[PDB]
Paper text:
The mosquito-borne yellow fever virus (YFV) is prototypic of the Flavivirus genus, which also includes several human pathogenic viruses such as dengue virus (DENV), Zika virus (ZIKV), Japanese encephalitis virus (JEV), and tick-borne encephalitis virus (TBEV). Flaviviruses, which enter cells via receptor-mediated endocytosis, use protein E for this essential function. In infectious particles, E is primed to react to the mildly acidic pH of an endosome to undergo a fusogenic conformational change that drives the membrane fusion reaction. Protein E is a prototypic class II fusion protein, with three β-sheet-rich domains termed DI, DII, and DIII.
In the absence of pr, YFV sE remains monomeric at neutral pH but crystallizes as a head-to-tail dimer, as observed at the surface of flavivirus mature particles. We used the protein eluting in peak 5 for crystallization of the E dimer. The sE dimer structure, determined by molecular replacement and refined to a free R factor of ~27%, showed the same head-to-tail dimer conformation observed in the previously reported structure of YFV 17D sE dimer in complex with the antigen-binding fragment of the monoclonal antibody A5 (23). There are two main sE dimer interfaces, the first by the dimer axis and the second one involving the fusion loop, away from the dimer axis. The first interface involves an antiparallel interaction around helix αB, including inter-protomer hydrogen bonds, some of which involving main-chain/main-chain interactions. In the second interface, the fusion loop at the tip of DII packs against DI and DIII of the opposite protomer in the dimer for other flaviviruses. The side chain of the strictly conserved Trp101 of the fusion loop is covered by that of Lys308 of DIII, while the fusion loop main chain is partially tucked in between two short helices in DI, the N-terminal helical turn (N-helix in Fig. 6B) and a helix in the 150-loop (the 150-helix). Residues 149–155 form the 150-helix, highly exposed at the dimer surface. Superposition of DII of the YFV pr/sE complex on its counterpart on the sE dimer structure revealed a steric clash with the 150-helix, indicating that pr binding cannot take place with the 150-loop in the conformation observed in the sE dimer at neutral pH. Thus, it seems likely that the 150-loop of YFV will also adopt an alternative conformation at low pH, thereby promoting pr binding.
Author numbering:
A (entry chain B), B (entry chain A): 1 to 188, 192 to 392
The structure:
């Protein structure tokens, strides 16, 4: 029934003697499956997530340079050295400066000069390895029984899947069961990138080709520090060493193209992916209809919710049954008030009210142009003039 | 103007003294860019294709076995051999059969037996290497000038791009030029799969992991033939060797979840993709309006095409200008027939008729509720009552 709440909807129609149907589930899309003498089935792809992905890399986009050491030697006096050159947490550069009288050198020419700086990563981007098998995907399933919207969540059977989890059964008490054989499609060489609270799906080759300092799994060592370090041309005894600007903006700019990932609120290790699609095969032969034996409702009913357009070309209404329960709710969509031929298509197959004062939510597809929605019979019946554009 | 023909449309609005705007171009979607005193610009992603991709592999899904040779030797008489065992075009199997009196062997036990069959691939699937750089993407650009639909294709400037092709200029004679800095997003490693006329974008790892005979680039050798060959348990001197069924169905089934590729009709090497998106930055400051000097149309005009809803919340109409050309077409959307305050938003900025009997197509966004569409002035002006739901 939840497809009504969802903008993008598709109707799968089953042929009378068939047992299986095929459905493609995209995220933020819903599918209503209809089969003759079978209750209509709403199936939708909730989330496609990955739980506990191992961290492959870290990419510093904001670096801080501290304790800059510069050593120099007059021309023809040898190469200048620093102990930091041996220190792994230091980014260094060896070069020469113009020396002579004016900078305390007895000889005019190129004098040795070396600069080292302590590299500290202020802000880095995490890169996670996504295992195809560890991919978990959740599918919501529900029937068109006549439950009020406020109850939808409690009637929705949640089907949990992982890569090759096998067929999942959705058992509805009083309506039998439907079976789902789902396969997640690996169409969506990829890392899970994380910057602060924001997450994306990136290409591995692209991420490795980023001109930025990167750190291996478990860390302890920064490679390619020179990507965030700037050495200006040397003066006689000094070199201006500067940390490059925060590359957060450039990174985000490059990431604008990329698919985004919602990090789970409760769990710091769960990552809900968008974009992915699921190919499902549904067995309906095990589905049945409740209240087939029920006598038709003859008592005065009323519209709790007037017939309203769903935006799906269908109409929903909420009918109250104060008396006569348990009973079948007679619903047709005729050409006029005289004719008794149903021209409409009932999504809520065999609507029933098990108890008195029950409010049954009914969805129906009226024909094009002018028609009349008729609920029940006799003088007490409910009528509502309708027009389909 | 072509966005009108396209279902999914988006309106980009430029701020008065700004020069650049950002647009995201998805396939089967259009974007209308509007800037004050600038002609509205329709931009859309036509095709994202790859030209001349090198063939990496071939995957046989339908094999044919011919000329079956079987050699055998009685127990304790040595191993049985065939010349075909060294022939690369032959799939072979070595095993033993139960031998003794009844099959012409003086000894009861396991006798050597070997079977070879000429392997011929009836039908195979091609796999192409897709170069990120060789990716070409085409963008259609057009202005809202007032051209009839039948002429749209001739007014559309085609902007050809490839990975790092640089900014492309779209020059419209009499309306200046617009500039586009586009970047294709390499979210869509990957092979290009081909079966008969049908093509798809597949994952490399998935394709390599297929339990089927495969051939290298510049082929002449088939590897893993056993995937399509069946050797039945041996009889005394014979083995029933049979080719396995056409795996076309299984392949297509697996391919249902994958992105599809349209092979170009004219070119056998061009492959148009169905999934990528393009991030574009558009410069509009160089765009100008034609007929700013034109005097307003004062002659009796007529509606060739009555104002019609586009489904985009806008209205299109086709106005004939028999006399007065060259002239400005006065168009406003007022509260009534008396008021002269334009409450509507004109998509066709400064509509003009350069020649007599010109039929100008005009699009405008009327305000909500009741309004009046007014074209021209005087007693000969055109009026059309409108309502926005």
């Amino acid at each position: 029934a939840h497809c009504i709440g969802i903008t993008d909807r598709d109707f799968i129609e089953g042929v009378h003697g068939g047992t299986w149907v095929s459905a493609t589930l995209e995220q933020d899309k819903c599918v209503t499956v209809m089969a003759p003498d079978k209750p209509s089935l709403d199936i939708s792809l909730e989330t496609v997530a990955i739980d506990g992905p191992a961290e492959a890399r870290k990419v510093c986009y904001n670096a801080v340079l501290t304790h800059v050491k510069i050593n120099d030697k007059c021309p023809s006096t040898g190469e200048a050295h620093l102990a930091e050159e041996n220190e792994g947490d230091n980014a260094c550069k060896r070069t020469y400066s113009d020396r002579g009288w004016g900078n305390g050198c007895g000889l005019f020419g190129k004098g040795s000069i070396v600069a080292c700086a302590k590299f500290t990563c202020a802000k880095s981007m995490s890169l996670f390895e996504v295992d195809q098998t560890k991919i978990q995907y959740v599918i919501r399933a529900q029937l068109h029984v006549g439950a009020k919207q406020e109850n939808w969540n409690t009637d929705i059977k949640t089907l949990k899947f992982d890569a090759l989890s096998g067929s999942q059964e959705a058992e509805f008490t009083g309506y039998g069961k439907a079976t789902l054989e789902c396969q997640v499609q690996t169409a969506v060489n990829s890392y899970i990138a994380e910057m602060e609270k924001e997450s994306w799906i990136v290409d591995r080759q692209w991420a490795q080709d980023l001109t930025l300092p990167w750190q291996s799994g478990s860390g302890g060592v920064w490679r390619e520090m020179h990507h965030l370090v700037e050495f200006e041309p040397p003066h006689a005894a000094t070199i201006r060493v500067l940390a490059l600007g925060n590359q957060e903006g450039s990174l985000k700019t490059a990431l604008t193209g990329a698919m985004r990932v919602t990090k789970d609120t409760n769990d710091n290790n769960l990552y809900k992916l968008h974009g992915g699609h699921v190919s499902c095969r549904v067995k309906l032969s095990a589905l049945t209809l409740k209240g087939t034996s029920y006598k038709m409702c003859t008592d005065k009913m009323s519209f709790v919710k007037n017939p309203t357009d769903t935006g799906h070309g269908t109409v929903v209404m909420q009918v109250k049954v104060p008396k006569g329960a348990p009973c079948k709710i007679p619903v047709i969509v005729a050409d006029d008030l005289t004719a008794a031929i149903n021209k409409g298509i009932l999504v809520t197959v065999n609507p029933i009210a098990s108890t008195n004062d029950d409010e049954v939510l009914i969805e129906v597809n009226p024909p094009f142009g002018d028609s009349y929605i008729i609920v029940g019979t006799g003088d007490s019946r409910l009528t509502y003039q309708w027009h389909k554009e």
